[PDB]
Each structure stands twice: as structure tokens, then as C-alpha cells.
């Protein structure tokens, strides 16, 4: 089962962004440690920044109350789009690795034209995937 | 053999409003009422859409 187009993964607790793999060895959820941490470094930075801006009278304090609530809305906007941007980078981070050794199923999943064991799976996840290693295997199976 | 790319979801009921949308459900949010508007929820987590 998919996959980020159709919805979120309740099975994955250890990350904001991740992979799910199924093969002869097993099926499981894994977190992408790099991209999530970057995001946290990012999310936290804005949050610290937002707080810093914060510190006739009833009347003016109502003005100020306004100032925050607007800021929240901007940053909440900026935030969710930041994630949406990031999930895209990851899919594509992967799509750029696999090329035609795999099929893009659509809805955010990939199905391999070659056999993928846990070691190859990991190579995909860490950005060291060896396209030529399986590329001959993949070319044939497509046909 | 398959691999999937996905995002996090959970049973968080927290909701926030953004410019374009109102009451979006998210995985985690922080409430800034420590230091009024009654709701000053700021999203940290991502949008909650379970499978």
C-alpha cells in the first residue's frame, strides 16, 4: 500500500519523511534521517525567530494581538508548504537515483524492474544506489 | 520488489488555521500561550491525512 498522494503513514512514527519497502526479505517503514533533521533545524529556527519579535491601552494591546495572529498564519502557511516542498524533493531524490531500473507507479510509489534486496534498498535510501549494477537486469525485464 | 516514498501521519487532533485553509489537522503543533487570541497554534508537524 501507497504512499503519500493518497495519504499519511500511521505505521511510521520515527520520521516526518521516509521510505517504505517490500521485498523477498520483508516489508517495512523507515525514516529519512537527513531530510527530517534539516526540517527540524528549519522549523525550530523560525519558531525561535517568531517568539523573539514578541515581548488607549486595552485598545492598542488589541492591535498587537492582531500582529501575532497574522504572523502565525504566515508561518503556518510557510510551514506546511515547506513540508510539501520537502516530500517532493525526496521522491525525486529517489526518482533521480533509480531511472529506468524501476517504475514510477504514480501516487508516490516505485516498483522495481530488478530484484531489490535489503542492501540495494539501503543504497537507494542513502544516495549511493548503483544504477549500472542492476541496469542490465532492469532493461530485459521491462520487455 | 517495491519501495515507497511517504510522509508521517498519526492520530493528532490538533488543528491550526493557515492563510489558505482553516482547521487543517496536523501531526504536532505548539501553543504559544506561555508568555489572548485564545488560539495561537503554530504548526511544526505536517498535515495529518491517515491511510
Amino acid at each position, epitope marked *: 500500500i501507497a504512499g503519500f498522494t493518497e495519504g499519511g503513514w500511521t505505521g511510521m512514527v520515527d520520521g*516526518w519523511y521516509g521510505y517504505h519497502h517490500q521485498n523477498e526479505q520483508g516489508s517495512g517503514y523507515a525514516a529519512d*534521517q537527513k531530510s*527530517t*533533521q534539516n526540517a*527540524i533545524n528549519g522549523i525550530t529556527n523560525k519558531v525561535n525567530s517568531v517568539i523573539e519579535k514578541m515581548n488607549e491601552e486595552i485598545e492598542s494591546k488589541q492591535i498587537w494581538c492582531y500582529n501575532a495572529e497574522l504572523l502565525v498564519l504566515l508561518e503556518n502557511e510557510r510551514t506546511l508548504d515547506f513540508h510539501d516542498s520537502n516530500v517532493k524533493n525526496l521522491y525525486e531524490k529517489v526518482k533521480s537515483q533509480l531511472k529506468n531500473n524501476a517504475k514510477e507507479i504514480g501516487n508516490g510509489c516505485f516498483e522495481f524492474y530488478h530484484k531489490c534486496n535489503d542492501e540495494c534498498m539501503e543504497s537507494v535510501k542513502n544516495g549511493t544506489y548503483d544504477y549500472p549494477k542492476y541496469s542490465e537486469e532492469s532493461k530485459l525485464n521491462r520487455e | 520488489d517495491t519501495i515507497c516514498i511517504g510522509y508521517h501521519a498519526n492520530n493528532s487532533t490538533d488543528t491550526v488555521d493557515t492563510v489558505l485553509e482553516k482547521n487543517v489537522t496536523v501531526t504536532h503543533s505548539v501553543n504559544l500561550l506561555e508568555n489572548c487570541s485564545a488560539k495561537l497554534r503554530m504548526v511544526t*508537524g505536517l498535515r495529518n491525512k491517515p491511510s
Partner: antibody
Amino acid sequence: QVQLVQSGAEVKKPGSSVKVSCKSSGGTSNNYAISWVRQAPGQGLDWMGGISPIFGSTAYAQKFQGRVTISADIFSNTAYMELNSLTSEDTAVYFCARHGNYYYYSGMDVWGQGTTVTVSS
Amino acid sequence: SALTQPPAVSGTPGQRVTISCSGSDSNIGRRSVNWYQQFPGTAPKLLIYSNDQRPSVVPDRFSGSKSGTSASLAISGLQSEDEAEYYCAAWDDSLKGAVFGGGTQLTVLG
């Protein structure tokens, strides 16, 4: 440079509860996972649980579950450990530690001085 | 203890000595390994993480390895200051918790 600052040593009669504090001094740790680890006197390390405030996680050891309340505060850069239903067996030295990243898989590279807590009737 | 460590090890100065960690598949088998160094009455220090990675400040004579459900920490050219208690650690998939070895006492008898 980041530093972890814990409340001073505590002593309690059994069955009461004690809450121990951890301040991130000289920077924030909100973007990190933090764990509470206890050392009984002359004993090995024992994981109690952890919290990652921005990530949105609160985690518990199975054994300390239902008895411990771990909470955090992003504004003050402070993490809390609360242990309940104290007994003599809960007498130990309690540490806070900051991980390499947001989650508990990474090695813990910054440690608080530790706070000693002793339970005697 | 989910992780198995020898109670004590000994070495003379200049020797290479090794410390063992025995686990099951639920922890070391599926998780990265961390090593900690502790001087008496003081807080622990992180020595090795992710099985073989070493912090920049730690002398090169420290090294780590992991095989199967067991791990080994190697200190070559042992020195008097290395005398301390050593803990292996890993995440445990069955327990959903960090687990620790019983602790290992290294003695540098010079």
C-alpha cells in the same frame, strides 16, 4: 557551545514523586532528542525515556511506563523528568543527555552533570 | 540486561585490548551501536556511535566494530588514563527502548 544544567540533588520519602529539570544553557536543544538515563549506585545505565520537543515525541521505556511523566518546554530549553510512586529502589543518579539528532538512534554527545536522588523512609 | 558485557578486563600499558557486547537480533542485529566511557562519580561520555564512527576529539586508538548480534570495541596502545567503566548501547526493536550492557571495568595496571 551548548550546556545541560540539571536541578540540584533531591531526597524524598518513598511513594512521593520527584521532578528533575534540565536546562539547555548557551543555546537551544529543541531541535534535538533528549533522554533521561539513570544510574543506580555502582550499576549499569538504564534508559527511562526521552523527549524531542519540535519533532513532537514523548517516549517511554516499557518498564518505566505509567510511572514516569516526561515533559518539555521549548521556550526555556528545559526538559523534565518526573518519577512517581518512588521507592528505595528508585534511589540513583539521574542523567539527561542530548543526542546527535532529533531521534534516539543517534549517539548522545552532551550530558548534564546528573542529579542524584535518594529514597529512604 | 539486554546487552551482555564482561564484568572486567585488564591490560598492561601499550597493549591492545578488546571489549565484547553480545545481543540478540532485536537490538544489535537491526540497530546501530554506541559506546560510552565513564570515569567514576562523573557523567558518561560518548565514545563510538553508529558502530564504527568516532568523534573528532577521541584518540584514534579507539575503534569499533559490529558483527551479527555482537560488537567489539578496540583500544590499541592502552594508557593509564583509559581506566574506566565502559558501556555498550543500542536501540532495541522489541522493547522500543535503548538498552545497556551491565558495564565493563577496564583496569590499567601500571
